[PDB]
RNA sequence: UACCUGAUUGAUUCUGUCAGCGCGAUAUGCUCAAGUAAAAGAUUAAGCCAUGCAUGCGAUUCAUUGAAAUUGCGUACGGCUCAUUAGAGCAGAUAUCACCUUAUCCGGGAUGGAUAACUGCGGAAAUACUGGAGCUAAUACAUGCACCCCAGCGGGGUGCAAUUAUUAGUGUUGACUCUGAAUAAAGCAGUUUACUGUCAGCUGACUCUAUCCGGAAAGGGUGUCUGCCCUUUCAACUAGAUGGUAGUUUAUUGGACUACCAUGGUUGUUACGGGUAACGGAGAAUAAGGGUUCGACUCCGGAGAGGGAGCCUUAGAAACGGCUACCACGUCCAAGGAAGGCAGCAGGCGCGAAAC
RNA sequence: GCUGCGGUUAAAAAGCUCGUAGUUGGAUCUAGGUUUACCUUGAAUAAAUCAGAGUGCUCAAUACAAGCGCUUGCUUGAAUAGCAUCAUGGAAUAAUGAAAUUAAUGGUUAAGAGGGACAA
RNA sequence: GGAAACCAUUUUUAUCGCAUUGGUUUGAACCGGGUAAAAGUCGUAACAAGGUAGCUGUAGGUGAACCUGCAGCUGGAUCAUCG
């Protein structure tokens, strides 16, 4: 059982303390070393520079060839790859493009049949994917 | 800082100055002089606001150049004077005289008063020492210093001086069963009549006061100044005789 | 006995050599007790002593005003210094309950008070800072 | 420059301890005066809020007090004999307060025979010279040598005191700060206070 | 409003998380009748900055009302930012019997010589650069107008503040080596209106300027008690370190510093070290209660002005829209030299998801 | 998870014991007919913000105003609530101290606590 | 008598040199671990007495799962077997 004398505030708080570090939130938001190993660095999105597109094999029971691209972000040189949503969308996207990036969903995990991306395309030469998906607008 | 602050922010003005949130960023900074800054009025918020004869401060200024107010019985011409507790401000264009008097509340007033009133003035002895050449003095809380007093005036007690005559005219005892006005805390503007006094050697003592109504209060010594002997005021009070209304009776009396 | 330094010392208000005391022949030299107040009395090793101390609350130049605590001598290993231990109980109001802290106090002992030992319970008033960490004067020994 | 600053010293637990600011003027040192024996000279320095002090580079006359007979005399300082501090203020001649000093002893004798119209342990062969009898052999009413009768009463002088008066060179202690006041007013060692300096001086000429 | 719902199984009950669901911050997509309040280059780059502004207004008036210049006062407040910083800084209480102060309050205390504007002569490619020659003012500069001793006939000294020493005990404070009263020298350099305008009737009354002393007020420097992040893959730390005496420095206390001496001081009640994408607080978001998280940011306190360091002036600055140097980086040169500091407002470039 | 979680099998009782710091510790002193700790009440305790009183900014978010006569005016609101320190009272609970010429001269009991002795 | 340049020295001390040390980031031949991925190869270790019951600690060996020795456990395939 727990402490309950009326003088065992120190072990008390101390306990707790000790134990909120086997807590994998307050871990997570505290280690530390966040900022150097998330690739946006605590931000919400990110640009960067489309090197190539690859194509991701669904998982089971699913089968697909997802459209992702591979990215270099500007701010730390850091490659990710990045899910194109709607469909025939990768055509808009041009290698050597600049990409807004965003998270998945699932803040840093992967959605999906998807395996291994986190995240996925906002913006393509500073247009909107869903514009030009919905043809509201046309490629610079 | 590097200096003296000349600078008093709207915000940080006294509450009880009562000012308007929303009247501009600053306020006017009271200069050094008789009465504290936190426990004082700047002569151009007398105008300005418990008056009405001003309506911005630059007309607060205009009338303050032509020479035409005076306190303690002399001439102030700037708008930043201090006015304090117990002043004596006499416009003698319009033949008004005021008493800076607290309210029940904690707040300075409109106390219109005549000319005996205004021709003397009450003081808190503050201390009682002895200037070079070997001549006795007495130092009041207003900053004021008078030679020569009686020398059964201790500290703590009240002397009437008269303004005309700059001279000690009475002095009221700090004891128990005198009526006391209470300055600072939050019984600020209460008066009752002095009871017990706890002696606290190397800090503030504590009196209490009872006022007419039965209620009873605790305050630092520092912040009560006898206004009379027994239960009579050598000055008069505003409507109210520090009577501190409660909050339901004030609506009660409202209506 | 008293004079073991490399200077003389005396207290500064007493005239040591007065010419109706040396003609008189009296060796009684007066000594000065200053009552330090706040109804504390001079301990009779201060009032009848021949020490010189410039820091006794008694015998020397150090008014007394501001905080009096009480504690535990710790050490007595200084020079006419102590270290006073101050126990308490630190309230933490998440929990409800009380945590023991501590913090420790350097004073300085008079010669005055000769019978401190650690354990003793004593009295402390505060003082100007009379060294880099000495800032209380020991007054009263309730042991 | 020089700081007086309580930071840059370590904690009472011996803790490195965090600078707060960059040297601030309030809190500045100046220069040590560090007054010897010689030909005046006092110069003028600004303190805060305007005021001034008066750093003594080098003196030579002290203005010195006889506690004793209550008087208070303007003598020559003449070498420095002790130092509680340190021997190098000695040898160097330095002149900071609670130094030991020898000072003359003309103007205290001066004084002494023209208050109680005695002689100060006169030597013991040779005849008093005109200044001396000017004071000593003056005449005058006995309305006034009333006076000087009734003072004559509470006269000894200590033999210690009196061996010094013979070298003519006074033990006296400087009890003003040269470096702050600008003087070096000190007192006549005498007593208890002298015999405690006089026997450190001649252990240390022992030694 | 003290609340849950979907998902492991052929089906069941659990543990348990993931997901949903409500609010808020920031960014962003699509889209936006008129109005009213109103945040807004903090996050990263306390990175770099073209150009404009952001600090100027009684005495002295032989220029033409008042220019120019000499004085005096202010520019130490105000504005910005949050880099540093973990007994620092802050919050509450509290000392300064250990201290410093312009402006403001109360008491007390009709002398002489020279320099600018101005005239004139010049130098430099170039500065808010300056040297000579001839005048001339002051609120500049200078000068300043009852007790002790000797002798009780008579001679001297004694203003305020101030150094040292001594005497008796006229007020206080809880207590004073405080404040008063005396005595003695001495140097000490501060001070007790050669100001402006004057008015009334030899007699009066003011404004102004200057000026010290004592007490207030306002501001500041330090001191004390309690509280304030994570970390043991930090358990022992500390040598001016802890204390004593004498001095020095300071506005003042103090190992603040020096000489001699002692061996001390902190620590599992967490010292010491490390990290912080750490300025503290008032507060903000969420919210049965108990809490969790945050707080660069309009108010209060602190710190900084590219990084350090040093100082002049002053009542107040270790000032940077002050100076001096070094470091980094720029600007103009006729190559001899001369300069610069937007984390003020507005703008520009970089940086970025991110701001007129 | 202090209020307020869980540890046989779902994650989780150290192999076991001794032991310092820490935490926690039996009953017992005026029922009847010296210290602390704690509780109550006051004092000292900037605004803005939050709560909250009043008041038709046309409502509201806000703001701190305003409302009446008749002209030379009267009366107003701008409230109130929101660790440490000091004092006051209370003496249960929990610690802590007293004694190894007269007087009752001065040692609570002996835990279905613990230790030690003795038996066989 | 006042005083500028200049000289010497004390102090504060920027800054520059090596040197030592703490903290972050990072290249690298090669050598390895982990994870993920619709339909690769080899076997059959486990789940039934899984065809040698399974498992724990330890030690050795073997392409691989694994096998074997020693001492334990039942989470066993026995809550039991007659004195």
Known sequence: ?140 | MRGPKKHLKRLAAPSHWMLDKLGGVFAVRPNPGPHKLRESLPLSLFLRNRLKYALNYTEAKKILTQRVVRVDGKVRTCHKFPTGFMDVVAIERTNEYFRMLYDTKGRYVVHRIQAAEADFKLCKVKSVRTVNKGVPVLTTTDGRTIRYPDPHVKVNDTIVFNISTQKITDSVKFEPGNLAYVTGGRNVGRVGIIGHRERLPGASDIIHIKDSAGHSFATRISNVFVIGKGNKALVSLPTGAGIRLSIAEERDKRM | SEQTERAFLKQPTVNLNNKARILAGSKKTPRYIREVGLGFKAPRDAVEGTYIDKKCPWAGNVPIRGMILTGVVLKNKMTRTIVVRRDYLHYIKKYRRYEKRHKNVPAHCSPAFRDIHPGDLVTIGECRPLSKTVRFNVLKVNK | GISRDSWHKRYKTGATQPVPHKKRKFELGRPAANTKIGAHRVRLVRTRGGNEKYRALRLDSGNFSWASEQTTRKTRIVDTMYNATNNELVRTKTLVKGAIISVDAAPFRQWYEAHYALPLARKKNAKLSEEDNAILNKKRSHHTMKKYTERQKTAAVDALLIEQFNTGRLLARISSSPGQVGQANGYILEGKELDFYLRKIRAKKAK
């Open chain 1, 1 to 140: 059982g727990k402490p309950k004398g009326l003088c065992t505030a120190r072990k008390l708080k101390t306990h707790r303390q000790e134990q909120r570090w086997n807590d994998k939130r307050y871990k997570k938001a505290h280690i530390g070393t966040r900022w150097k190993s998330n690739p946006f660095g605590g931000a919400s999105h990110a640009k960067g520079i489309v090197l190539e597109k690859i194509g991701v094999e669904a998982k089971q029971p699913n089968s697909a060839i997802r459209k992702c691209v591979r990215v270099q972000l500007i701010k730390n040189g850091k490659k990710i790859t990045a899910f194109v949503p709607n469909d025939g969308c990768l055509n808009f996207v041009e290698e050597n493009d600049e990409v807004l990036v965003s998270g998945f969903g699932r803040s840093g995990h992967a959605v999906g049949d998807i395996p291994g991306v986190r995240f996925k395309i906002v913006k393509v030469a500073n247009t909107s994917l869903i514009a030009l998906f919905k043809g509201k607008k046309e490629r610079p």
